[PDB]
Amino acid sequence: MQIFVKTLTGKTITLEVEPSDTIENVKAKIQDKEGIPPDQQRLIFAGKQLEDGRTLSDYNIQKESTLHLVLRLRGGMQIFVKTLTGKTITLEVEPSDTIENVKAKIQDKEGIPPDQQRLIFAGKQLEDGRTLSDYNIQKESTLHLVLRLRG
Amino acid sequence: MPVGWQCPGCTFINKPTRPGCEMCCRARPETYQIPASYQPDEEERARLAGEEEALRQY
Ligand SMILES: [Zn+2]
DSSP: OEEEEEETTSOEEEEEOOTTOBHHHHHHHHHHHHOOOGGGEEEEETTEEOOTTSBTGGGTOOTTOEEEEEEOOTTOEEEEEEESSSOEEEEEEOTTOBHHHHHHHHHHHHOOOGGGEEEEETTEEOOTTSBTTTTTOOTTOEEEEEEOOOO | OOOSEEOTTTOOEEOTTOSBOTTTOOBOOSSOOOOTTOOOOHHHHHHHHHHHHHHOOO
C-alpha cells in the first residue's frame, strides 16, 4: 500500500509499505529516497510522535494515510528564551553550542544582532565563549533575553 | 487522543502549557486555552514548579 509523508519544506514523499512495517522500516525507506539518517527523523500521525518499534497497523495507519516528518538534530534539545517584550521563543540547540552560537540562533528567529543580546540564566549573565554544558543548561531550560537598544 | 494544542505546522498535539511545539519549535496558537483540569506529567509539572519558584522571593 501507499502512504505519503509531508515535510515542512512542502514536499511529499510517497512510500510503498505494508501494514506490518515498523516505524524503523519506514524511516529507512525515507533514507533510501532522501538520504536523511533515521536518527534525524521524527514521524507524526494522529497528533503523536511515532515509536520506532511499533508498526503502521499499531497506529491504525491505512492506505493513503499522510504522516508528517520533522527533522531534528541527533543529540539536540529544546530551550525556551523568554523576552521582556512579550514573546517566549523556542530554540533547538546542542549542549556543545557556545553562547555565541545560541545568540546566532536568536538572531535568525528574532533579528537581533548578538552584540545587542544579553542572555541570563539562573540570575547569571552568560559569556559568549562558554557552552550550554558549562552552565549546565538542560532540556527545556528557560533563558532570559534582554535587548540592548541604543539611544 | 492526547489533550493539548495541535501544531498547525506539523500536527503534533502539544502539552497545553508548552510555549512552542515539542517537534518543530513553532509558537503556540494565540487563542488555545488550557483544560479546566490539566494534570501535567511529572516532568512538565516539575518544569512549571521551577518557573514559579524562580518568580518568587521568600
Ligand atoms: Zn510542530
